[PDB]
Design a protein around this ligand. Sequence first.
Ligand SMILES: Nc1ncnc2c1ncn2[C@@H]1O[C@H](COP(=O)(O)OP(=O)(O)OP(=O)(O)O)[C@@H](O)[C@H]1O
Ligand SMILES: Nc1ncnc2c1ncn2[C@@H]1O[C@H](COP(=O)(O)OP(=O)(O)OP(=O)(O)O)[C@@H](O)[C@H]1O
Lengths: 721, 721
Amino acid sequence: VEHPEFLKAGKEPGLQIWRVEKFDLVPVPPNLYGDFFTGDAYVILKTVQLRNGILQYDLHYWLGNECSQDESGAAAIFTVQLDDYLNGRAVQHREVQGFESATFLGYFKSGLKYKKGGVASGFKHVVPNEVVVQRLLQVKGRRVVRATEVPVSWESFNNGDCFILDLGNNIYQWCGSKSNRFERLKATQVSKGIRDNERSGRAQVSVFEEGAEPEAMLQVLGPKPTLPEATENRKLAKLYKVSNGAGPMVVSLVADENPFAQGALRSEDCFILDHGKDGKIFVWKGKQANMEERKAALKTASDFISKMDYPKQTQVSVLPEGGETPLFRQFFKNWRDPDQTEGLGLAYLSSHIAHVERVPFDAATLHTSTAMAAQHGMDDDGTGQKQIWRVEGSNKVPVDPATYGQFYGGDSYIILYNYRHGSRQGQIIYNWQGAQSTQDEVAASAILTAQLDEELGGTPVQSRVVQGKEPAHLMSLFGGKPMIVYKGGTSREGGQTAPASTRLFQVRASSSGATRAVEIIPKAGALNSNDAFVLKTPSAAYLWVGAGASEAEKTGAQELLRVLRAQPVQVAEGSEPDSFWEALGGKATYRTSPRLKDKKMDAHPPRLFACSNKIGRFVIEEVPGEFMQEDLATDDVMLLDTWDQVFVWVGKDSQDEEKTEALTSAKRYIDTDPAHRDRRTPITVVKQGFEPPSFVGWFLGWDDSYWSVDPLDRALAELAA
Amino acid sequence: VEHPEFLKAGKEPGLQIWRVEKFDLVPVPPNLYGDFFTGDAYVILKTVQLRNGILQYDLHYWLGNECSQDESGAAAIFTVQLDDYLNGRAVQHREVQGFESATFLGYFKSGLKYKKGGVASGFKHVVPNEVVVQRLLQVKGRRVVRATEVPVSWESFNNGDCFILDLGNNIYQWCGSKSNRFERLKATQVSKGIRDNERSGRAQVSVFEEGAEPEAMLQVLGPKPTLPEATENRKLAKLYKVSNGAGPMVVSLVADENPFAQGALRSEDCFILDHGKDGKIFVWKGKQANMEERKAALKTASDFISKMDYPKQTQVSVLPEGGETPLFRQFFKNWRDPDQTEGLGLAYLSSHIAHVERVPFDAATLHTSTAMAAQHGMDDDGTGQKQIWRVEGSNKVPVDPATYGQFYGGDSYIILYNYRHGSRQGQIIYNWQGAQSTQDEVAASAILTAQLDEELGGTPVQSRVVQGKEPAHLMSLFGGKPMIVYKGGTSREGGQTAPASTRLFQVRASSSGATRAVEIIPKAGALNSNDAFVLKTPSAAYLWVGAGASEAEKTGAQELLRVLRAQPVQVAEGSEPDSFWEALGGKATYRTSPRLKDKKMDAHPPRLFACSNKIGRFVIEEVPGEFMQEDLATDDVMLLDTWDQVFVWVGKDSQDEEKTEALTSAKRYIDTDPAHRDRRTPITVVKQGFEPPSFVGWFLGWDDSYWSVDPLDRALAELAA
Ligand SMILES: Nc1ncnc2c1ncn2[C@@H]1O[C@H](COP(=O)(O)OP(=O)(O)OP(=O)(O)O)[C@@H](O)[C@H]1O
Ligand SMILES: Nc1ncnc2c1ncn2[C@@H]1O[C@H](COP(=O)(O)OP(=O)(O)OP(=O)(O)O)[C@@H](O)[C@H]1O
């Protein structure tokens, strides 16, 4: 038999939810997805279509707080057995009521309902046409909304939250006096949800505020009393080996600090990546491993949590070798996988960007498409008017228009750019900060950038970049010329100081076709097979063009040579005269790392976070699922972490200290990241109502007028409308 | 139209309940009678068949605590209009959730359910086969049980009460650790009730005790926390006249203290009988009155309660002249009504004795019928063996067998009687207490009576009687001879002291045909048309036999004369020589009051009460409805108030102080009665398992084995059986 629902499972892309009922899988009806009984356990399978057509599986089992020891054992058993039937390629997750993963929560954008009861109490997710209902839902959460069934009583209430008194044909949404308007909008989505999905749109949602409680409400609840107020270093992990059956657990430390070596993961063994400080652990299953310790990976994860005195509700993932997720992969130094040089996409595609249509860059049609803008980091073609300045002292000093495109590493600059994307106009201010610029000048450039923003109305995008990690759009501001970055001194008055005798330049290109030439230390083990290089030497000048390189960096490298007043010696990779090598002081290992080009997004999917400087305390909460304009709360500071770049979207009604610390908050986020990632990553401050295309292009249903009418008033004009 | 439910109304004996729904009468389904929404109002019509065949109506409107001002106005409007359609002869009642009259509560023996919600909240008494249910009922009350729907939460709970977690197919009765076993038996009746009446017997009642909470319960409620403890001169009234439309209320005091004169009630006017101290008022509607102030009697009652600052939930009855109830009639001096000399029964028949078959007395068949025994106060024919004793000092002294039947008012006696009723055997101890007996001797007789009880095993009935108010059974212990009671001195040694020259004797008969001759003051205004009298005078002796008198008192009076050693002069009433009248010292008003004979029970229906000497505090709570053995809690002291007599039934497991104060408790009850009733009323202490026929005869389904198996264990062996 093997299990009849196993044959229904994982056949097409979609989401499938079974509830565990007396050691059987019973399908939850699709219209009630997101409903979960508190005394039950469930299995959830999400099937994603990978770009190469092959299928992807995330298996979760979810455990209610009032769950039996038996019902949850069955959920695990089925999870393991379903993974087995899916040929052991599924990523597995243990999810616990109130504490479930960002992936899981993303499946349910209308939110979760935690219901009272379960199988043992006789309740099911089914309901006779004519159903009588009398329940109270307490709605909690900004980013991830959770409606919990509570006792039908004023004792469940407070003056901070929203509540829904569900009377069947009539749904009564009540919102506390201290309730914020964003939370109301959310409670509204939930109310709408009950009406549309239970009920079949055959119900009247009316909505009220504390003090104006209606007849129906006061009838079932009695007189309203005085109500109470509502109730209100995670970067370090360790890696471990593990050899057991299920009882005699052998746990040996392999790496004491992240970032970890990818080579520490070996196919014979199994490891636990202990990120338990931040509420998460992973079990990695080597592809040879041992069938009995692969199959007991959940039990092993359990034993580890017990042995370490981490909470029960600690999240758990088990990934098989080759089926790793970004979250997992982030903890390692330089993840690579030889099979994925060629192919469409990668072996995993994060659910929240699975629906995103990939659009390749096309200068001709860029004005036509915010999606393209977003995916290649280009707010426009780069041909708009611009002022470039150098910071000297406490002043902006016009750079000589002849040198536009040349940036010196002893300086910090500010650029003012006007952008046109037909659809949208605006301004970007780039603050380029030299790696050798004095601290006072760097800092000065930042304050001056911030001041220019203020004098210009508050509207312009504000982007900090650091030498070497130039964003796509800044590289392309110079016609077809490359952005030249010298490692050396300055370009002021008699800042003077001439050349180093021997200089190397790496010439890297972007999606847009633009190039930057960065001056680097002239060594052999800094050569890169994907770029053009230029080696200026007292003798002559070499134009090394690598195997993986293209026309764009060839042409960009020789346009640098004109500026350097030298003449090239074309030379393909590997067949190079050894005056070349003697100029570098030897000959060493390479980089032949063919770049994650189109696959950038797959390896490092964009992620949306909320940001808080509340009570001298820095917290980030991920908003899960597909990106939505509605999640951008007008009183919040948000972070859109493309990998290339970190946008910080600042809401009009956010606190003034918070939106002044926008750049600092983005840095904290970047410095705090478990991936131990490039501290030079560009940060881009964007303001509500004045978002650039490369930001809005990540949000499918972006609406320019969305805030033109207060979003809550619109939502309400559909429920009583 | 007049109202289609009006035509369905009051046609046959029975109970009808409509719920008020948007100014309409909608019938509650009969299986849910006793269910009432807390935010609704209802109309309840109880039709009783009077013994003459004519119909009787009690109209209640019931107001939930969460009731609208509009829904309750409609209830009143319908009540008044329904009374009008029933030709104005209904008795009317304003009933309020939690505070409803003894009559009303008597209609619902399984108890009442107060439900959350109502019409405005969308809830109805109907329910789709397949209905999902999840509710909590808190069960409260000993005599009148009330299950209230409460929030589904441990916060609703306490360690004292019983609760029912109704999950639909499974009903979970929980009983606190401090919950007494009688209360559990009741909670069980409610649980059974839900199973049988909702659900159609298609549900599993399981029952539990605090500490043993089952999976289903803990699943919907969460882990059980520490639970809290459960939460724990009314004889004086005044009469008032009242002349108004509905606003300008004129209220004039007519009588300052009860007992009231019946003549104070006059047909032109309306009165309020203010017993608001005890939670009750009455409006009496004169039969000429004035149609507009008759029809606004409820609104008048309202205005009175406001003007007097009595609680809203104060009970209200409006009775029409001639349609008065016992509760009402009790407040007056000597209620009479000329039309009811002849006829079958009276104009009102209290609902709780409406089903009682009247069995007239028949010596031949008395051993055959406990009903007869009860209704005439005869535990048997009276021919059993008996010892009579006189109390002299601290001793019982055998009375001379020749004088048996002669009792002297300067003595107190005790009689030990053995009774046989085929069905039942037992013993009665009568303690007769002379009106002229010294206090020490009276008291002595009581202690000696109590001691004889104890020495005889605890089993015998124990009956205190006072000279003049002899019970039926004691009169009939003397063959066909009358019970002679002298007002004078004693019958001991040389207690001696001879006659008064002129002596009168009243000779009254009972149902059984037995007579007592009582010596009274020889006056004309003590003559009574229903009795035989005997007037001994130095000259000769008169046998006055009244018009209303019968053979029984004739014969009884002349058997007294033989004992008095005199010879009679027969003389019918009205035609009497005036040597007769000169012996009495004149000639005055009579009594021609033809006795309430068969109608005794109608005028003064028996009533069952629980009794408590708890915290130096004397409380009586009426157990309403038809009399049930099940209501006789084995740990309680109860009072069965026949009018003639007050039984006090003492439960085996009642406290020792309480059952020693049994007689005193009965007296307190009698002295406390608003009727200001005869303080000489015989009190009869009866013990659990050893109840006499004249007690058990009032209980239709009396079962001798009922306590042979603990009643709770039996009830439980039907729910899980
Ligand atoms: N198959 C993959 N799965 C997960 N991560 C990958 C994969 N391939 C490359 N990466 C990681 O993500 C980054 C992308 O590799 P890529 O070659 O595109 O970066 P790079 O060109 O070496 O340097 P840069 O970060 O400046 O682009 C690297 O840090 C690499 O370790
Ligand atoms: N129609 C009636 N309705 C209500 N009470 C009545 C009615 N008739 C008589 N009674 C009351 O109840 C008692 C019964 O009247 P009845 O003539 O039977 O008593 P009695 O013979 O005068 O004295 P006793 O109480 O000793 O029998 C009286 O107190 C009387 O006021």
